[PDB]
Amino acid sequence: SSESYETIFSQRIIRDLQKELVVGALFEELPMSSKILTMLVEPDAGKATWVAASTYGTDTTTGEEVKGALKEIHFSTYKLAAKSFITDETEEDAIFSLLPLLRKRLIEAHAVSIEEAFMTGDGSGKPKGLLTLASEDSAKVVTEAKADGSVLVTAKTISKLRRKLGRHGLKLSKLVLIVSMDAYYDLLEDEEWQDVAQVGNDSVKLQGQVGRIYGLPVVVSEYFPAKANSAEFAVIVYKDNFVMPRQRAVTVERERQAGKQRDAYYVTQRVNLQRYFANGVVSGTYAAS
Amino acid sequence: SSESYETIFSQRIIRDLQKELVVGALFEELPMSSKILTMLVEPDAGKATWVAASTYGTDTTTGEEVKGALKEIHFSTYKLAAKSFITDETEEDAIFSLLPLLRKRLIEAHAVSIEEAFMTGDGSGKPKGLLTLASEDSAKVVTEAKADGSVLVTAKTISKLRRKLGRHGLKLSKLVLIVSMDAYYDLLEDEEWQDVAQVGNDSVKLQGQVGRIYGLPVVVSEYFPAKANSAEFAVIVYKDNFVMPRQRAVTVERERQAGKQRDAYYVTQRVNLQRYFANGVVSGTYAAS
Amino acid sequence: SSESYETIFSQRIIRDLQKELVVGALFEELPMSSKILTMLVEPDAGKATWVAASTYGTDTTTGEEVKGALKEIHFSTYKLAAKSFITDETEEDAIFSLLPLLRKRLIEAHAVSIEEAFMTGDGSGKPKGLLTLASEDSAKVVTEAKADGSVLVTAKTISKLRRKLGRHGLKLSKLVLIVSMDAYYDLLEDEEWQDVAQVGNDSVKLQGQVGRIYGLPVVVSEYFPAKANSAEFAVIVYKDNFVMPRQRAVTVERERQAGKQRDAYYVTQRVNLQRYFANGVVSGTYAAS
């Protein structure tokens, strides 16, 4: 029964460390059931939470006001499988000497691809990657870094970032920056630490990454191209939208033959990631020029 | 059925979850029953009690001696509702248990709004804003620290007020400091340790607040404006002044229809916030101007 | 008599403890029992076999997708010889137990050789060693130190090599620094300890390797050849790079003759160092360059 049902109820426990890789791999889990879970509902957007039941009934104007929100929350993943195989038909002598050994790895690059696409995705097949949202959140903000040539990615930069988001965001609570390595490359190994960067070690407090640019322990991760023109910087409020419609129980399907003298194990995934607004990130930019 | 009246005390123990929002909420017990509780007392703000029996009631100077008081101790609350939809209609395709998938959110932001209103409010409908309460007694001791950038009082004025109100308040009964994360970047990322400060664990034996200098386990959490002028500290005897005069358990109101492809949610919360005497609270400042 | 079986238990338990000599090597040991574990796959080097299976998997380059990746992962370990008879003519004096002194130091230098061989080894009969496995990748980098003159060498080295380890694992898991005490003579009695060099216990905290560099902890001692041109360092994530593919160990034959009457304790051992990737480590360098 090698590569049947004897281990596959535990590689998902490995995925219980893979999704626990903090490139950003939880905003909020949205457990589910069907194909799509839809709510047409209008989120806490335009508030009005409590009223005192007392003074001015919305005090004239505007009505709704700004959305709202309708879009909707027809929320839906894809099969984001990282289906694998080996040839079992080789190791066929009561082995069982591979059993985490051939995994913890599948589950890795599985998740690595997952957050890779979470920079480098869309909605197609994989959901949104944020560089797609970067180029379209109307905050490709230019020209920040001249980048890879006569550069000063400072924090007046990041001040324009934060004062181009805290609008739609809240203010420094929580809100996140997500960057490149090249960001915390040359904006570390320096005394800048511009208003801040360096490092704010801090350890422990909360989720704890690298840097603490205004306390924000940043996401390098980076699935960018360097090449001067991308983002490094991704200023956005973590605790707003950008939620994770992660759906279901993962069923790797250790199918057998399938010829080629091999056996094939269908490292599934059905999760998704999605927002709640018109806007989202502040995007670079940190451009060719 | 569903949002009709059934998941009920559910949302009350959810309110038990963010009763534990750790900012002002840990206060003094009060299941009211009338509209406004009114007590009467010329309170702890003047007398000077007890007799030396033979020796006397202190003749000419003085006897009244000031005010007083004849205010008196009426306890005036309002209500926190929560008005928002959920479509309890198109979604009927067999989940409903989906209520926990849908809920909390509003009761969350409800409570968020609640304690931010405690920081920021006007007295009316929400109670009085904590910085406003810092403003009206001029707990603003401008400008101890100065305008967001090399800002200079560690616990210095805090020890000044650990003598000033720390006097009709005391020392570590209760004594707290709500701060900013701008302020957390000041006096955490710290080396001192004045009494306690570093790193803000700090011994422990507290109540759960982020950082601790001296023996004041500290609120950061921060619901003011940052920017140069706010009170980035909050030196208040957290056991004397400012009780919550609550009313009841918050009742939720699962009215359904309320027509036209939607429904009707109300979550009537009547806790409050009220003090007694003059001033058992300082704060900041730390000031632009 | 002695020189025989009743020793071996009380001998291999001594081996069961310097088993834990951790003085360079400690991984997750692949156990074996046959001979070769040979695995017929290409590891993590782009697959990550993600699927939409749905949209369009970019019909151009390349497929697999890059070099290579099957080595193949063969694993027949290495029979490790130590050997030393004793005064095998004189526990006819029934000493039972001078060997509690008289043994174990054989396990001492035995394991001394083991770990040296492990981190400095040719490939053959052992497997490979660290600076040796450093020594074909051009991880000999340039020119962070300069011929042991102006050797005040900090962590900029470690910064850009940390960015080299900004790689495909994480940050600081594991990411280490098997070092030299002359490499410590750079950054012991440094005034910096810039990021961190010292105390690196720092409490004590991690394995037994105190001194850390952002958590890059310390293994010095009699491995690095000096005069600048070996590494000062061993910047390797212990996780992704390497495991131990061991099988057996001590099944020492305490054979007898061996002339002038002494007992051939023909000492056995079988463990392994072997890798997967292209790169697992850059280190130093720290060169005469």
Phi-psi region of A12 (alpha: psi -120 to 50; beta: other; left: phi over 0): alpha
Strands C244-245 and C29-30: parallel
**Distant-in-sequence, close-in-space partners of C235: CB < 8 Å, separation ≥ 6:** C158, C161, C162, C164, C165, C175, C176, C177, C216, C281, C282, C283
Hey, is the C-beta of A170 within 8 angstroms of any chain B C-beta? no
Q: What is the C-alpha to C-alpha distance for residues C7 and B274, in angstroms, rounded to an integer?
A: 80
Q: What is the C-alpha to C-alpha distance for residues A228 and A206, in angstroms, rounded to an integer?
A: 32
Report which of A108, A106, A91 is spatially closest to residue C75, judged by C-alpha positions: A91
C110 phi, psi to nearest 5 deg: -50, -55
Q: What is the C-alpha to C-alpha distance for residues A240 and A276, in angstroms, rounded to an integer?
A: 8
DSSP string, chain A: -TTSTTTHHHHHHHHHHHTTSTTT--S-B----SS-B------SBS--S---SSS-STTS--SS-S-B--S---B--------EEE-TTTS-SS----TTTT-SSHHHHHHHHHHHHHHS--SSSS---HHHHHTTTT-B-TTS---SSS----SHHHHHHHHHHTTTS-SSSS-B-B--HHHHHHTSSSS--SSS-S-----SSSS--EEEETTEEEB----S--SS-S-S-EEB-TTSS-BB---S-----EE---TTT-EEE--------B-SSS---EE------
Strands A216-218 and A234-235: unpaired
Instruction: Tell me which of A49, A202, A241 to substitute to probe the interface with B (most B C-beta atoms closer than 10 Å).
Output: A49
Q: What is the C-alpha to C-alpha distance for residues A235 and A170, in angstroms, rounded to an integer?
A: 12
Report which of A111, A53, B250, A120 is spatially closest to residue C50, judged by C-alpha positions: A111
- Entry field: residues in chain B: 289
Q: What is the C-alpha to C-alpha distance for residues B138 and A238, in angstroms, rounded to an integer?
A: 36
For residue C99, the surrounding DSSP H or E stretch is helix C99-102
Shortest Cα–Cα distance, C249 to chain A (Å): 18
Do the Cβ atoms of A252 and A221 come closer than 8 Å? no
Shortest Cα–Cα distance, C25 to chain A (Å): 19
Shortest Cα–Cα distance, C245 to chain A (Å): 11
For residue C271, the surrounding DSSP H or E stretch is strand C270-271
Cα dihedral C68, C69, C75, C79 sign: positive
Tokens of C91: 């526990």
Strands C218-219 and C177-178: parallel
Q: What is the C-alpha to C-alpha distance for residues A53 and A50, in angstroms, rounded to an integer?
A: 8
Contact B101/A52, CB-based, under 8 Å? Answer: no
Angle at A71 between CA A67 and CA A77, to 5 degrees: 140
Strands (E) in B180-223, as ranges, are 212-213, 216-217
Minimal-distance CA residue of chain B relative to A172: B181
Number of H helices, E strands in chain B: 6, 8
Report which of C236, C167, C280, C243 is spatially closest to residue A101, judged by C-alpha positions: C243
Shortest Cα–Cα distance, B104 to chain A (Å): 12
Contact A52/B225, CB-based, under 8 Å? Answer: no
B52 phi, psi to nearest 5 deg: -80, 25
Contact A49/B84, CB-based, under 8 Å? Answer: yes
Do the Cβ atoms of A224 and A131 come closer than 8 Å? yes
Do the Cβ atoms of B287 and B148 come closer than 8 Å? no
Q: What is the C-alpha to C-alpha distance for residues B199 and B196, in angstroms, rounded to an integer?
A: 8
Do the Cβ atoms of A192 and A180 come closer than 8 Å? no
Instruction: Tell me which of B189, B232, B252 to substitute to probe the interface with A (most A C-beta atoms closer than 10 Å).
Output: B189
Chains contacting A (3+ CB pairs below 8 angstroms): B, C
* CB-based touch B/C (3+ pairs, under 8 A): no
Hey, is the C-beta of C166 within 8 angstroms of any chain A C-beta? yes
Place of tokens 């009920």: B8
Question: What one-character DSSP code corresponds to residue B219?
Answer: B
DSSP string, C13-78: HHHHHHTT--SS----EEP-SSSB--B-S--SSS------SSS---SSS-SS-SS-----B--B-E
DSSP string, B143-169: SSSBSSSS---SSHHHHHHHHHTTTTS
Query: Which of A50, A52, A172 is the closest to B226 by Cβ?
Result: A172
Name the β-bridge partners of C244.
Answer: C29
**Distant-in-sequence, close-in-space partners of B62: CB < 8 Å, separation ≥ 6:** none
Contact A185/C163, CB-based, under 8 Å? Answer: yes
Tokens of A33: 């059931």
Do the Cβ atoms of C44 and A105 come closer than 8 Å? yes
Contact A101/C30, CB-based, under 8 Å? Answer: yes
Question: What one-character DSSP code corresponds to residue C283?
Answer: -
DSSP string, C138-154: T-----SS-SSSS----
Burial class for C35, CB neighbours closer than 10 Å (0-12, 13-18, 19+): exposed
Buried/exposed code over A51-78 (b: 16+ C-beta within 10 A; e: otherwise): bbeeeeeeeeeeeeeeeebeeebebbbb
Contact A21/C170, CB-based, under 8 Å? Answer: yes
Q: What is the C-alpha to C-alpha distance for residues A240 and A235, in angstroms, rounded to an integer?
A: 12
This structure's resolution (Å) is: 6.7
Q: Distance between alpha carbon C12 and the CA centroid of its chain, in Å?
A: 21
Query: Which of A32, A41, A55 is the closest to B87 by Cβ?
Result: A41
Burial class for B261, CB neighbours closer than 10 Å (0-12, 13-18, 19+): exposed
Q: What is the C-alpha to C-alpha distance for residues C214 and A202, in angstroms, rounded to an integer?
A: 11
Report which of C137, A215, A127, C87 is spatially closest to residue B182, judged by C-alpha positions: A215
Angle between helices A8-18 and A106-119 (to 10 degrees): 40
Place of tokens 């920017």: B227
Minimal-distance CA residue of chain B relative to A46: B84
Q: What is the C-alpha to C-alpha distance for residues A155 and B191, in angstroms, rounded to an integer?
A: 25
Hey, is the C-beta of B225 within 8 angstroms of any chain A C-beta? yes
Minimal-distance CA residue of chain A relative to B115: A50
Q: What is the C-alpha to C-alpha distance for residues A151 and A232, in angstroms, rounded to an integer?
A: 13
Q: What is the C-alpha to C-alpha distance for residues A103 and C199, in angstroms, rounded to an integer?
A: 37
Contact A52/B124, CB-based, under 8 Å? Answer: yes
Residue A204, preceding peptide bond in cis (omega within 30° of 0)? yes
